[PDB]
Structures are given as C-alpha cells and as structure tokens.
Amino acid sequence: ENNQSPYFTMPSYQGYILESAPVGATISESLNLTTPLRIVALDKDIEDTKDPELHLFLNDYTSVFTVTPTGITRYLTLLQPVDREEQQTYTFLITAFDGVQESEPVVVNIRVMDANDNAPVFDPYLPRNLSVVEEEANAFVGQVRATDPDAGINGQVHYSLGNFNNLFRITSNGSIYTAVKLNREARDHYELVVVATDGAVHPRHSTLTLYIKVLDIDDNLEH
Ligand SMILES: [Ca+2]
Ligand SMILES: [Ca+2]
Ligand SMILES: [Ca+2]
Ligand SMILES: [Ca+2]
Ligand SMILES: [Ca+2]
Ligand code: NA
Known part of the structure; x- marks a missing residue:
C-alpha cells in the first residue's frame, strides 16, 4: 500500500533560464543553458523503473514556474515572462506527495540570465x-x-x-x-x-x- 515517504534524489536544485526565454521553456541545469534541470522523485512503495505517480508542488512562485506532471524524471517550465532587470534570482521549495505523506522539501534556486534586451x-x-x-x-x-x-x-x-x-x-x-x-x-x-x-x-x-x-x-x- 503506501507507508514509505517519497523523496528527491538530490539535496537541492540549481536552475538557469534566459530572461528572453519564451513561456513554456524548460529550466536548464547549468549557466550555459544547454541540458535541462532534472528533478527525480522516487517512492519505495513503488518498484523501481515504474512511475511513482507523485504530486510535486512549489511553495512559492506558482504563477511563474511549474513542474511537468508525470514521469519518474520531472522538469521545470516557465509560466510567465521573467525579467532580469526586475528580479534576477528565485528561491523556493518543492515537495513531493504520494497521497498520504510528503517528502522533505528541497530548496530550488533559479538564476535568470541576462539578455541584451535593452538599448541605451x-x-x-x-x-x-x-x-x-x-x-x-x-x-x-x-x-x-x-x-x-x-x-x-x-x-x-x-x-x-x-x-x-x-x-x-x-x-x-x-x-x-x-x-x-x-x-x-x-x-x-x-x-x-x-x-x-x-x-x-x-x-x-x-x-x-x-x-x-x-x-x-x-x-x-x-x-
Ligand atoms: Ca509512498
Ligand atoms: Ca537584460
Ligand atoms: Ca543593452
Ligand atoms: Ca562672423
Ligand atoms: Ca567666420
Ligand atoms: Na529585461
């Protein structure tokens, strides 16, 4: 049944996104904006290689960022345009829930990278x-x-x-x-x-x- 708490496979997460990035864009794992940030949540009630069907949720910035809704490996995607000249750094928690118990929260930091989007x-x-x-x-x-x-x-x-x-x-x-x-x-x-x-x-x-x-x-x- 459901007596084991879900958990993230890393202790924290650092993401990167360019401010000019379109709504829908996936958050990157490094400052070179190449490979994606992968967020993996497991649950020992579920045999490995099977999707544990967890609900992942953010504690803040829920109108700015969302998690992909299914999969062993989840990604973060942009909900609305961001702006480095108004806010450059986002910090929030993500939590996994199996319907009964939560994981420990994990800290996520995202850096918004500068685009040359302004003229003098x-x-x-x-x-x-x-x-x-x-x-x-x-x-x-x-x-x-x-x-x-x-x-x-x-x-x-x-x-x-x-x-x-x-x-x-x-x-x-x-x-x-x-x-x-x-x-x-x-x-x-x-x-x-x-x-x-x-x-x-x-x-x-x-x-x-x-x-x-x-x-x-x-x-x-x-x-
Ligand atoms: Ca469980
Ligand atoms: Ca800029
Ligand atoms: Ca400029
Ligand atoms: Ca003269
Ligand atoms: Ca003259
Ligand atoms: Na800007």
Whole structure:
C-alpha cells in the first residue's frame, strides 16, 4: 500500500533560464543553458523503473514556474515572462506527495540570465538645443548621457556620431566638442546625430538628434 515517504534524489536544485526565454521553456541545469534541470522523485512503495505517480508542488512562485506532471524524471517550465532587470534570482521549495505523506522539501534556486534586451536610453532632460561660438577648435558644444539597464557589457554605453564626424568629437562621457573651427558664414546650424551603443556581442544602439546653433563673432573682429 503506501507507508514509505517519497523523496528527491538530490539535496537541492540549481536552475538557469534566459530572461528572453519564451513561456513554456524548460529550466536548464547549468549557466550555459544547454541540458535541462532534472528533478527525480522516487517512492519505495513503488518498484523501481515504474512511475511513482507523485504530486510535486512549489511553495512559492506558482504563477511563474511549474513542474511537468508525470514521469519518474520531472522538469521545470516557465509560466510567465521573467525579467532580469526586475528580479534576477528565485528561491523556493518543492515537495513531493504520494497521497498520504510528503517528502522533505528541497530548496530550488533559479538564476535568470541576462539578455541584451535593452538599448541605451538618452537622458531626456539634458538640453537638445545647443549653441557654440564659431572659429574655435576644441570648443565645448554640449553633453549627452545614455544609460542601459542590462548587465555587464550589455549595459556599458559607448558614444559616437552619426554625421559630421570631421566637424565634431564625442568623449566617452558624452561631451561633444568641435574638431575644427566652425564658421557661421559658411553654415550656422548642425543637426547632429549622436549614437549610444552598448558593449554586447550583439550590440543595440539608440540615437538622439541635437540642434546646434553656431554663434557669431562679428566679422569686424575675425582676423
Ligand atoms: Ca509512498
Ligand atoms: Ca543593452
Ligand atoms: Ca537584460
Ligand atoms: Ca567666420
Ligand atoms: Ca562672423
Ligand atoms: Na529585461
């Protein structure tokens, strides 16, 4: 009949999932997101090689993760999209039940791996209408800043220019300077494309357009 408590074959479980993973995805056993986490529950009332027909259940995160419902070997699958930028680690217990007695609970930890799922976002408060005086190389034009909430290289931001790359320079902290002496009598305005690109292997970028006005030096004072 049913006098032996079911039990898991390992003392704990560590899982890994990429945040971009679709609902339905199986949780992996290692950080390389290859082979699955296998959760095996046995019960000595049942001859080996036979499915002990156990009920496995989680103590928390029951809207986020579920266990496959049959089999000697069970897997964990995603119920809803996860987000590393909101929560990176899940910890909960799983328990097996044979209809009469429970197993000891086992601790499961899952790490959500980062996807490069965010582009840099420009700070919307830094001015986009800028001025600079003509006839001065290395003159400060303006400041931009972008931040990227992804992890490590996926969240590191690099700046470049999308146009006028012989006229302006941008620094690694978002400061724009003239490369050369501007000349208002040649052109009094520049619509400068600034690019913020992350450090990902598969990079993402964003752009901003800056409205630069060239200020006059009275022509009587230009040498
Ligand atoms: Ca049993
Ligand atoms: Ca990113
Ligand atoms: Ca991310
Ligand atoms: Ca001039
Ligand atoms: Ca002038
Ligand atoms: Na995310």
